[PDB]
Design a protein around this ligand. Structure first.
Ligand code: FAD
Length: 525
């Protein structure tokens, strides 16, 4: 019998499989529905870390195919369609397909988690784990940093910036923003070279970091790839194993404990199908209720995104071409919208220039939002995706933050060092920026039209989280405890980005690494 079966070999599942199997007495099985990414055969599209958007132009090869979601909250006089939502389907999960940025968020984010009932998940309690996971090439020996972890983090040298990037920075300086240098150990508004994870020009996923050749040869670790868990197996209120599809064949496998690291949209769907969720919803689908847990699939967080682009004039294109650090991430900006004094640093913006598409861009998202959505089952079938409604801009403060970020962009590009380029900025969808949205100067004059545009075209940033949240032991809406144990049943944990009580002011991969490090420690202790 396996001591632990870990469902989903993504960012969190890779950490857990590594940490739990470091103890030889623990017989660990890691099960991953997608392909392996062993060192001698990382797909080229995955391996190219300088072009980390490439997986998304390779169709659906590396994702859960035809996984669609509803995005913006339903709203009169706006029609919404299902949208494809990339989620990694291969060893490494999101770390194998993502944009390679590695950032922590802010102390306030984690202190809030503890305030919301996740004891020991305050900044003091998560920082050790952010240290453990990393080797920071720039600041590794400094306080608040690690120099020995499996995941490298570094930044481009400021002095390698293109002349266009420098112009952007002079605009931000005219706004009183500093260069903060290290977004992972300095927490006020400003701009910085983004911290990212690469091994030279190669992507370095959690599978390369935690499931390396030596870990893989541990006799107590088993790795099943191209193997899909369909159901959790139960004995009374105890989870006691899994059913696994391998090609055409189904296998039943016993487990002393199952740990779900199947991703924020899929871990809660598995809970629902097991009978762990809102009792009336489960009754409705004829699923016997093991535990009436109304929070399962609720509390769905994301970061709400939009873009602004402009054709590069000659001077912008020339200036954009002088960077000495290639197509690495150059510039990030942490800013405050002013919409709610409770949420400083609630916007993340990037300003940059791409000779290839011919576009300058200012893309941004609400990094500390107010809106949450939910997911529920469509039916009881193991092959169904859940019905997902991110419900973006349900809370009007998030609309307000989008408008503010657009006004900020206006302000920055009116500064002389950006104004000299004579760019004509226009709105765009965030995910694949392109022509077709209205001029920024024009839309801002039309508040009705501006709101309609945003409700129509608001995007996410693939930061789905919170659908199986940590919460207090008496909290009817909480799903797991401080060590990931699912309330109402035994033998079952969740240990992925599902468990976040709120999304941090951060891209979610590094917070995911951290929380999986922390949960592994709790298990082991
Ligand atoms: C396109 C994209 C770009 C992003 N950009 C960044 C970025 O630049 N920086 C950043 O910090 N974050 C960003 N993120 C987010 C980040 O990568 C994820 O938040 C993180 O990977 C979540 O980790 P996880 O372990 O919760 O889920 P995942 O890494 O998604 O892992 C879940 C794993 O479970 C497997 N699985 C699911 N169901 C089953 C089943 N039934 N049986 C077996 N296996 C199963 C999946 O195939 C997958 O490998 C990005 C995400 C995407 C998709």
């Amino acid at each position: 019998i396996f001591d632990y079966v870990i469902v989903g070999g993504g960012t969190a599942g890779s950490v857990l499989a590594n940490r739990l199997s470091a103890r030889p007495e623990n017989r660990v099985l890691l099960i991953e529905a997608g392909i392996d990414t062993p060192e001698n055969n990382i797909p080229p599209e995955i391996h190219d870390g300088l072009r980390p958007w490439l997986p998304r132009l390779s169709g659906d090869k590396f994702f859960w195919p035809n996984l669609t979601i509803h995005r913006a909250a339903e709203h009169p006089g706006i029609t919404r369609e299902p949208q494809f939502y990339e989620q990694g389907r291969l060893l490494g999960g999101g770390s194998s397909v993502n944009m390679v940025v590695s950032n922590r968020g802010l102390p306030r984010d984690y202190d809030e988690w503890q305030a919301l009932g996740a004891d020991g998940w305050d900044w003091q309690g998560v920082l050790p784990y952010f240290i453990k996971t990393e080797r920071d090439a720039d600041y590794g020996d400094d306080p608040l940093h690690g120099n020995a972890g499996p995941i490298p983090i570094g930044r481009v040298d400021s002095r390698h910036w293109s002349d266009f990037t420098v112009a952007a920075t002079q605009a931000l300086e005219a706004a009183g923003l500093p260069n903060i240098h290290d977004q992972n150990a300095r927490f006020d508004d400003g701009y910085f070279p983004p911290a990212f994870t690469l091994k030279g020009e190669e992507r370095f996923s959690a599978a390369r970091g935690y499931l390396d050749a030596s870990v893989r040869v541990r006799p107590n670790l088993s790795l099943w790839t191209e193997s899909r868990v369909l159901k959790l197996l139960t004995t009374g209120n105890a989870i006691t194993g899994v059913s696994v599809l391998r090609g055409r064949e189904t296998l039943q496998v016993q487990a002393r404990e199952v740990i779900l690291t199947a991703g924020a949209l899929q871990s809660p769907a598995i809970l629902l199908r097991t009978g762990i969720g809102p009792a009336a919803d489960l009754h409705a689908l004829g699923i016997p209720v093991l535990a009436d847990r109304p929070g399962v699939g609720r509390n769905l967080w994301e970061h709400s995104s939009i873009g602004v682009v402009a054709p590069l004039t000659e001077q912008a294109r020339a200036d954009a071409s002088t960077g000495k650090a290639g197509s690495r991430h150059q510039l990030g900006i942490r800013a405050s919208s002013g919409v709610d004094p409770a949420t400083p640093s609630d916007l993340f913006l990037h300003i940059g220039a791409d000779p290839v598409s011919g576009l300058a861009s200012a893309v941004f998202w609400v990094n500390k939002p107010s809106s949450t959505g939910w997911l529920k089952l469509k039916d009881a079938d193991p092959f169904s995706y859940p019905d997902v409604d991110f419900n973006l801009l349900s809370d009007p403060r998030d609309l307000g933050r989008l408008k503010a970020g657009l006004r900020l962009i206006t302000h920055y590009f009116a500064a002389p060092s950006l104004a000299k380029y004579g760019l004509a900025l226009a709105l765009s969808r965030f995910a694949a920026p392109q022509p077709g949205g209205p001029l920024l100067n024009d839309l801002l004059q039309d508040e009705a039209a501006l709101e309609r545009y945003l409700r129509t075209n608001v995007g996410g940033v693939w930061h789905a989280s919170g659908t199986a949240r940590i919460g207090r032991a008496d909290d009817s809406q909480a799903v797991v405890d401080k060590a990931g144990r699912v309330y109402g049943v035994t033998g079952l944990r969740v240990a992925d980005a599902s468990i976040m009580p709120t999304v941090p002011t951060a891209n979610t991969n590094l917070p995911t690494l951290m929380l999986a490090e922390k949960i592994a420690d709790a298990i082991l202790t």
